Design a protein around this ligand. Structure first.
Ligand SMILES: Nc1nc2c(ncn2[C@@H]2O[C@H](COP(=O)(O)OP(=O)(O)OP(=O)(O)O)[C@@H](O)[C@H]2O)c(=O)[nH]1
Ligand SMILES: Nc1nc2c(ncn2[C@@H]2O[C@H](COP(=O)(O)OP(=O)(O)OP(=O)(O)O)[C@@H](O)[C@H]2O)c(=O)[nH]1
Ligand SMILES: Nc1nc2c(ncn2[C@@H]2O[C@H](COP(=O)(O)OP(=O)(O)OP(=O)(O)O)[C@@H](O)[C@H]2O)c(=O)[nH]1
Ligand SMILES: Nc1ncnc2c1ncn2[C@@H]1O[C@H](COP(=O)(O)OP(=O)(O)OP(=O)(O)O)[C@@H](O)[C@H]1O
Ligand SMILES: Nc1ncnc2c1ncn2[C@@H]1O[C@H](COP(=O)(O)OP(=O)(O)OP(=O)(O)O)[C@@H](O)[C@H]1O
Ligand SMILES: Nc1ncnc2c1ncn2[C@@H]1O[C@H](COP(=O)(O)OP(=O)(O)OP(=O)(O)O)[C@@H](O)[C@H]1O
Ligand SMILES: [Cl-]
Ligand SMILES: [Cl-]
Ligand SMILES: [Cl-]
Ligand SMILES: [Mg+2]
Ligand SMILES: [Mg+2]
Ligand SMILES: [Mg+2]
Lengths: 247, 247, 247
């Protein structure tokens, strides 16, 4: 046989490139996943991830309470933190023993898989009682924020999209929902009657994951890298596996 | 300039009326929210609110367990109350230390924002094992109860709609789901293919809120009134902010 | 009057047969329920049931954590079991005091009501971090497994459909979502614009139930049999109430 890496008959090499190209492009097909991660960063260095993976479209909806840090199997002062909630839903509305709950997220990162169409991304960053803009009567139920999403580039390939905002001020008390639609460069509407009920089933079939990792390093090692997820750390370092046309 | 409140050139006055009219009418546009509140009233005077705010349509789905009172950070006798559940799912099916759990709701109030079309309201008030009418084989999955919803009037304006039923008997052990569709006087179907996928995204983007307030007074002060929500208290007093054509 | 059970004028008998036939056939109408049960079997003999009942379509979505056994009001070693989760999300990723968590399900049974169309059944049996097939880039978000569903026959009538798989190996660490569509032998698309928004409302109105029964016998007695649900026990015994054309 020919010698490896010297001719057009390195079929092992051509198969390896095809395998990676097929995965990248299958992800972008109508049969592929679109994936959303919401990372909540806490002052103790830990990071809650909410992940959802689904066909056609994907979303995550959180309230002020559900984004707060919960240390499973450790002391979370649940009564005091319920009083924090009362005091955050309405000024001077509770009696916690603290000015600022360290369970409040300090930052949110939203990451989409590269199979999303950024023009469809919608976000409702609301107040602590789950109103998009102060009062329901004046509230558009979402903002289209795709123009703020940064590309996560690795080796010249877009491995994901990131929107990141900090919550450093005492009044950064939020509720959060995010939604994005899978790429569809075709004119075949996936939610038109020929396929509409499969989009309803995709709502049933969406797989959700949640975990609080002890720090960004551990998140990077045992979640992002282990499962070929895109990521952007606090030092602006990009993570991901470039696939298209690549060995 | 002209003197305030004497002529047609009080632009400050005309702007104030426009601002309120715009909020009222924006809420009723296809871009606006439709909002649902389910209030569960407990014998100790406290009130659980489940709220959801979303575009196009909105809903809440609860089971018998999820409506029971949970005092966050206090003793809830979780083992005994699990035995209550077993004894409520099937007669003589458990061994709690009590005949009637005081965590069982005594009443439900359903309130919709004025942007709902009452003809679309649907409710599945089921039994304790989440069957609409005793057995699945005979169950229509909802009842259309819009004709029972009372208008919450303030200053002549409908600020919301209310359906209220008490659960005073020992056999009032329910599961509950409610759904309502936003007003659409146009013939443009918001869930037809031109816009269907935005309705799927509205399912992702719906913002949810839940809290147990210690009494109706506190609910009225720090939730209803603070955020311009409609309400109807036990004394048939109406709460809300009239907006259309108003300063 | 005629004597009972001797002539065509036993209207009591004809009414009884009609009543049962009407229930069976109403369940199969577009107005009827389609119901899904996911049973998680634990090594201590207890069984978690997740049930959802809804019109048009129905689904359940679980992750690795949410399928684990939780003994309400008893000791569940929450910190140790969080370390199990970390160690199951990534090999050698945690420090629990145990090799195998007895909270891990040993088997899953999926049961649909007889009103499902098995050709629409979809399942995403994913890994412990909620990926269908190891990596998102290669993942079809579901498998169509209807050909594996066994009919639950009683007295010659299909009272339900069952898919059962064991999780006996240490690497059987799963996430699970299931979806099925109600029968529609007509060509009237229930999710076409004439009725699409009612399918969105059915997403709001779906009633959910969850309980952990102490053993299969108790499940059979106080859940399956009490509410005329189909079931298949470990000894291949079928449970259900045949209805069509029957007294
Ligand atoms: N493209 C390129 N890569 C370089 C160069 N010098 C060092 N490298 C490294 O080599 C890597 C790319 O090697 P290859 O993937 O085999 O080259 P390629 O440009 O992708 O060409 P093909 O894959 O054969 O189509 C890059 O990631 C660089 O880190 C250079 O001059 N050009
Ligand atoms: N309409 C009306 N309001 C009265 C009358 N007497 C006292 N009021 C009070 O005045 C309030 C209404 O005042 P306005 O809003 O300025 O009057 P309006 O009828 O709404 O007329 P415009 O707002 O200027 O279109 C009501 O809420 C009443 O409580 C009365 O005779 N007619
Ligand atoms: N069909 C049938 N059932 C039998 C026979 N022998 C005993 N059985 C029992 O009788 C039951 C059926 O009785 P029926 O329901 O009154 O008879 P059927 O065949 O359903 O006829 P109809 O209901 O009158 O239309 C079955 O469940 C059997 O357990 C037999 O020879 N034929
Ligand atoms: N030294 C080099 N000279 C020429 N081309 C390179 C070199 N290094 C990488 N490339 C090519 O440039 C393209 C982008 O690679 P590059 O490493 O710049 O992406 P990147 O990971 O986004 O870089 P960075 O993260 O440093 O901004 C790839 O196709 C790669 O093959
Ligand atoms: N004394 C009054 N004389 C004439 N019109 C009034 C008077 N008070 C209010 N109105 C007008 O009547 C309309 C309805 O006001 P009203 O206060 O009756 O509503 P409401 O809050 O539902 O009343 P209630 O709660 O007492 O039944 C409004 O347009 C208001 O301007
Ligand atoms: N001994 C019998 N002779 C003739 N027909 C019977 C007899 N027993 C039942 N049948 C009829 O056969 C049909 C199927 O009944 P059968 O009891 O076999 O269903 P099944 O419950 O699935 O049986 P099994 O669970 O034992 O496999 C029914 O219509 C019933 O009336
Ligand atoms: Cl495709
Ligand atoms: Cl509009
Ligand atoms: Cl029908
Ligand atoms: Mg290359
Ligand atoms: Mg006025
Ligand atoms: Mg018979």
């Amino acid at each position: 046989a020919d010698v490896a890496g010297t001719s057009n008959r390195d079929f092992r090499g051509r198969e390896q490139r095809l395998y990676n190209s097929e995965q990248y492009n299958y992800n972008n097909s109508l049969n592929g996943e679109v994936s959303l991660w919401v990372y909540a960063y806490y002052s103790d260095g830990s990071v809650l991830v909410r992940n959802c993976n689904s066909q056609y479209k994907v979303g995550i909806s959180e309230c002020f309470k559900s984004l707060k840090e919960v240390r499973v199997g450790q002391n979370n002062d649940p009564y005091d933190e319920q009083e924090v909630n009362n005091g955050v839903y309405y000024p001077n509305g509770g009696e916690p023993t603290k000015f600022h709950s360290n369970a409040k997220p300090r930052a949110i990162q939203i990451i989409f898989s590269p199979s999303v169409n950024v023009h469809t991304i919608k976000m409702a960053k609301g107040n602590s009682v789950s109103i998009p803009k102060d009062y329901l009567q004046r509230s558009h139920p979402w903002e289209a924020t795709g123009v703020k999403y940064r590309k996560i580039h690795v080796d010249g390939e877009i491995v994901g999209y990131s929107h990141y905002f900090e919550l450093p001020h005492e009044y950064n008390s939020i509720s959060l929902s995010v939604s994005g639609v899978h790429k569809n460069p075709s004119s075949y509407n996936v939610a038109a009657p020929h396929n509409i009920m499969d989009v309803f089933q995709s709502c049933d079939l969406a797989l959700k994951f949640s975990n609080r990792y002890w720090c960004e390093l551990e998140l990077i090692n045992h979640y992002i890298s282990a499962y070929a997820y895109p990521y952007l750390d606090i030092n602006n370092h990009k993570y991901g596996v470039p696939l298209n046309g690549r060995q």
